[PDB]
Design a protein around this nucleic acid. Sequence first.
DNA 1: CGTTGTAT
DNA 2: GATCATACAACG
DNA 3: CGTTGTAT
DNA 4: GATCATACAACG
Lengths: 671, 702
Amino acid sequence: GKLADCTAQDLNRTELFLVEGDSAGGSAKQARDREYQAIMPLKGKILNTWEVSSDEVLASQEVHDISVAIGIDPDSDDLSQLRYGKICILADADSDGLHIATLLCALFVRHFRTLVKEGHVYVALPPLYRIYALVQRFKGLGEMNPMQLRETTLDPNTRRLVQLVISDEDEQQTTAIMDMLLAKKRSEDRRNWLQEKERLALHEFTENAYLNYSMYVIMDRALPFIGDGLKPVQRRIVYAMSELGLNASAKFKKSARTVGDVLGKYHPHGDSACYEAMVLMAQPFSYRYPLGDGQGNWGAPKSFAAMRYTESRLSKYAELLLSELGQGTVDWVPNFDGTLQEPKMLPARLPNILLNGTTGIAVGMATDIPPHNLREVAKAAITLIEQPKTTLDELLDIVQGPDFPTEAEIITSRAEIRKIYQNGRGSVRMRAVWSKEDGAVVITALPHQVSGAKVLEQIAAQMRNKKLPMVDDLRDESDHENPTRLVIVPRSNRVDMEQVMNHLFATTDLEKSYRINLNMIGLDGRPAVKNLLEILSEWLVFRRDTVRRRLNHRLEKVLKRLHILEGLLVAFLNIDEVIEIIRTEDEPKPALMSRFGISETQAEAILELKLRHLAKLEEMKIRGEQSELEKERDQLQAILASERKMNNLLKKELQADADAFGDDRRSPLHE
Amino acid sequence: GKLADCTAQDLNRTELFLVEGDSAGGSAKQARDREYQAIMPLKGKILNTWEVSSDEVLASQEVHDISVAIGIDPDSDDLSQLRYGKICILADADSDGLHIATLLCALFVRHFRTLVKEGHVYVALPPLYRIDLGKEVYYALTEEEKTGVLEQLKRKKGKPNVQRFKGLGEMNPMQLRETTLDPNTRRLVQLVISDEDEQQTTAIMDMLLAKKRSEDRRNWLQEKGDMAERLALHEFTENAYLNYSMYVIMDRALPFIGDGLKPVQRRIVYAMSELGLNASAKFKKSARTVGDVLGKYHPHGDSACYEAMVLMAQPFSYRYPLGDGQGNWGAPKSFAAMRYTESRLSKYAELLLSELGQGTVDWVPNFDGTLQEPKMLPARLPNILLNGTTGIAVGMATDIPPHNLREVAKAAITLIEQPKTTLDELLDIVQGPDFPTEAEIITSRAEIRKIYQNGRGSVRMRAVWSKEDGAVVITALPHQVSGAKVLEQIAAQMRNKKLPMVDDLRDESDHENPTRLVIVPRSNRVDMEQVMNHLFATTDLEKSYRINLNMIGLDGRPAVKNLLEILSEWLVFRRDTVRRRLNHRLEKVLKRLHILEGLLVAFLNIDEVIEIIRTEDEPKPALMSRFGISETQAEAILELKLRHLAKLEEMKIRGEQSELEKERDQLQAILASERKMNNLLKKELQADADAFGDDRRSPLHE
DNA sequence: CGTTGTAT
DNA sequence: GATCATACAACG
DNA sequence: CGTTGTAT
DNA sequence: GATCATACAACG
Ligand SMILES: C[C@H]1COc2c(N3CCN(C)CC3)c(F)cc3c(=O)c(C(=O)O)cn1c23
Ligand SMILES: C[C@H]1COc2c(N3CCN(C)CC3)c(F)cc3c(=O)c(C(=O)O)cn1c23
Ligand SMILES: [Mg+2]
Ligand SMILES: [Mg+2]
Ligand SMILES: [Mg+2]
Ligand SMILES: [Mg+2]
């Protein structure tokens, strides 16, 4: 179908390239030899055909096209109808590229063992840098010129293609190693595996390739950092918005601009997934504390408008992550192009990891953190600072539990919640809020991530199957005033609507379960499941560090300014002689230093003084500023040397921030 | 199908909204009443069912879904199965929105006349501006209405917020509800076709939506150059289609004679200039520049924008591209995504972007009003003839072939030297169109002369082939010829037994030789010339090209112009822009000289100056009085640094003063002489011709 | 019908 | 990320 | 089986 | 500009 076949059938000379990107496929087809080189693009990530039947594999259109292209059936085929001498897999140097490579290797090993054993499976190794090396630095196959692609991966005289082989006595390890990687079950074995950690062995390639993707997804994709509770994509988005000046007080700008900036500066991925994550951050029903200010259609409790239409802006809450940024609080690593710099963390003032929470899926592990109440978590942190010996139960007496932005009751025993937080893993269930008035049941609040229309459809279908003769009629009185209003009117006032309600809790989606897995990337740099006490403590460490760094930065600034000011006052005290030196001495810079006992910095400061600064008001301003800066310097130096004053400062900032960004408990606890 | 129906069947109360955007449809569905309001989105421009059969209309999925939604067949139906009391068309305030409106009006008028006559067709008028000062909030569909609102708000506590809606997708659901949905606050007009007006309605709508005619639309556009509860459909349709027509003509399809660019292209190259993506700069991701174009200047889609950009980057599409990309930008077709490709302006683009910040072009504010945008670009060479353009508007179109830079430059210089130069004399310089595809342009020089004399015509190209040895080898194809399509054509022609003379067809097109098509004959006695003529007549080895020199002149109105008119008018543009540059630089030099004189005066009496500074409260007016010095010079003295009190600084200032005096003399001299001005223009033209010069790619033959 | 190029 | 139907002029 | 959220 | 199949962990 989408194949671009060659003008030859002679094996041991013909080559079939499987390209990752359709665009990359176009570039490859533009540079092939055509006399023996055919190019077939595989649109997107293929299926995991390691636990699929030999007949079920033909169902997937990608694997189907691959099968038809190779001219072999997923069973013993043994050449014969092999249309190409060599089948080479060509994907870019991404971790995702190695993932696709490992997938194709799984498909080939499991369903075409004869082909791999005969030595027809090849891996194309593209260069990572060009000055070629396996400086320009190619981000992908789509980004590199056709001729470059030809020289790098196509032309045999200049190519670097390795042959993947599964020799005897290594075939046992191959089938064994590849199993734990691509098996839908196991999973824990993959956790432990990640924990412990011209021709090439297929088992060696698969093990090293899958490690790259696993580590990349775990560290730089699915799992959030304990500091600001953000994933790389989200951090890049909010920072690129900060750079775009899109503050909460600023005017709205088109989403396409900020997205294009995120891609063009920091995020080397697609615009679709980026704008998707952004839209997710902008939704009040998706995010407890969004960041998170949009104009236009940003969805509803679903799908939204295009980025070419919507306009965006950071929330006032986002300040908690973006204030104190340019004050030497976070470290900076350079971006993919090396043209700009990017913050590794954000100077969070409140533990966003607990506030907003996160849900993600990596390789071998996942993360599921529920949102919480800002005031409660803040109070818990402050309590943790005041009394460091505070146990988990006392913290639980402050933080009731998860706080979802969907109202409704969280029906879960306080002991069960206590266990969930003490062990870091568990499940929390929510139930819709309903009231009888009058005699009829009206739902006024739905659980988190409940469609509402789907619930109505569920009850309606259940009625249609004659399973609910107790209910006379179902009406949706959900208007602008009342967002969620689902009325259920029963036939006769003798029917137990409570029993029907419990039945709806058991059958419909009025009651929902939520996975809880407090897994995150700690300050150590490695992912780990942590309990509430550990999270609050470690975050307290992070905050303490960042605050300390801010204080030191400000201290240095103040000191330098004080030095320059002292120099300036010295200048003013003897301005006539200074100006005289300027207009009578050859190179007055070192002359000023000698005559007044002044540093080169202070000398340059004097030299940079303006004539309008010779007025008296300027000397007054400078002296006053000197006094103020002296007091501030004393304060900063004082707080820096006392652990008590430092902790007190942290407490002050926590309480102050808790008041400004505070919110009442939305989802109450019940049973 | 995509309908979000309401929970009622009671007519004279139920309303059906036809939304332009699926996203806007989402916003509308999110804000409807559901008790009587149903929402159906129409994704994209509908079909023009004004010359289509009553059955052919049902073939188009959009019109089909609309028909099923209304519960009426495109023939006489007469209510009965009418599912909704009112059918309202909802589109954003674009000219494109009014186009969609006119299209839906065509569909309803021709195929559902009974429905429109009964009064069920409604047009929803959305607000263009939103003004809010405090708890007060106002909406306005007219700019005059907006300025009216602002005048009233001038009595209240200041600082009002104007929003300006670019479309329905960008406005919040509740705003859409209050503005166009909620009956108590909406502004929906009823479209009616009363008796004796139905004849005029059918007449006016015909010339607008008829595939033929066209010239009538030209003449109509030529001659053509508050609200109530109900409006005449013919009055609405004629004015709506006028808006779209004028918008497409002026701000879409037709290029401006100055820089030879369309609004999209101009916005792209300017946004690249602002992004600092110069020819000497490093490549940046295309998504960045596209996102900038959309986020700053262009209020349209990213796809079509990146499409135009990619088209500008192609060496085979653009004679002089601008136009520097890395990655897959297509081949002689389609390309890679913007998330992968990297971009940068060409060295040629300098000709449009140099002299930008020198007061050469006018500036209009952007859609948000936050930034400014150039109306034109200070072109140094007539890009309108160099690159050429192809576009389709309403009533008219434009087809301009590319030309050779050296030839056109030489023609311009010749036009400056001898202003009485005729068209033939210019034609002796400019041979004709110059395509970036090699190959011969087999067209009589007289025919070309006529084509250029009338501004309209057609130029034909033919592939370049040679016999070696005994076999025919094609080495160059005409512009926009696929080659693979040519191969497929000849091969199919062979398969149909139409070519028994030809033994074999081979594609020896490699990296070294881009186009190499070998045709081997059976036996050496067959006349391959006859076969070649047959392939020229049948296959795509010979291609015709439309020529329609229509463009927007300096007058501001589109018109077909001949080569002499184009070159002359462009010479006017260039002369004017150069004059503006010279004047700008002159003003700068003069001001700097003034400031320098002030500074020297200050240096001459520095002690007294410092005295005034340290003895007079606010010395600015004191310095002015004591030395006879302007406020600007006073501020200049006040901003002097102590390190500038040295002698070397005064020396530098004096030397710069001398230089600036000489430069001022030169600038003022060139400004007052027509001969010196013309000499400057000639010098710059010749200089540009050398640096950006190109050899003739497509030779002329017969 | 089949193109061409900015638009939805 | 590639693809699908549409408007509009006007020639082969 | 069907979700959830960054990825091809 | 909306849509379609995929990986990955893991619960109901
Ligand atoms: C604005 C959207 C509107 O919808 C579109 C299409 N439709 C889908 C099938 N429908 C039956 C008819 C409408 C379409 F076929 C192509 C495009 C398209 O190429 C495009 C672009 O920006 O390049 C943008 N759009 C398109
Ligand atoms: C990798 C690209 C190309 O393939 C994609 C899809 N396929 C099309 C149908 N095929 C049968 C299977 C693959 C797809 F259904 C969705 C997406 C998608 O949502 C997306 C994104 O960036 O958000 C990007 N891609 C997608
Ligand atoms: Mg990639
Ligand atoms: Mg997607
Ligand atoms: Mg619009
Ligand atoms: Mg398109």
